[PDB]
Amino acid sequence: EVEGVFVRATVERRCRAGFCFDKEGQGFADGVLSDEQLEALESDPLLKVERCTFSG
């Protein structure tokens, strides 16, 4: 099981091309790959964040 999910329509910093804008991607508290890119992508939320059990 993976612990870590953000499902409150919450905002996170995801960078597409030359800018970082609101979007929900990985949104997990565990990492095995893309750690250096995840840091920029996984900036903790701006707004209310609540976690669930995807169990994927």
């Binding site: 091309a17 030359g18 800018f19």
Partner: protein, 137 residues
């Protein structure tokens, strides 16, 4: 893609692009799109080399000065042999000087259509700031 085949034709006329792009037919008849695409890609790669330290790479918009620089570099790249005193070489050198001036913070990257470019966060970084005892306790 800071410049396109249309931009090259407009800046240097279609005849010159045909002459410097068609390498298999003598006299030239058609413009080779692959060669022009490679030249434009090389110009963009050089410009990114110059601009990587101050702005984001995948620019969402192309500033006009960037279009002129890309067109000039692409045309200079379409010449198999380019001597030192060729005026096209001098134009390429002037454009490279403009790029270097931009990189060294002496020139600013202008407006794209109405909004500013996107500078990188290189200057933003500061430690964090520890100022307890100053929060209206």
């Amino acid at each position: 893609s800071y410049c396109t085949l249309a931009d090259l034709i407009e800046q240097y006329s279609e005849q010159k692009i045909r002459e410097v792009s068609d390498r298999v037919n003598k006299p030239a008849t058609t413009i080779d799109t692959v060669i022009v695409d490679r030249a434009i890609a090389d110009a963009d790669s050089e410009i990114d080399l110059h601009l990587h330290g101050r702005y984001q790479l995948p620019l969402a918009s192309v500033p006009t000065a960037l279009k002129r620089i890309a067109c000039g570099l692409a045309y200079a790249n379409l010449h198999i042999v380019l001597k030192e005193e060729n005026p096209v070489y001098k134009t390429a050198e002037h454009l490279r000087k403009l790029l270097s001036g931009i990189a060294n913070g002496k020139l600013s990257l202008a407006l794209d259509a109405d909004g500013k470019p996107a500078p990188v966060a290189n200057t933003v970084q500061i430690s964090e700031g520890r100022n307890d005892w100053g929060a209206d306790w």
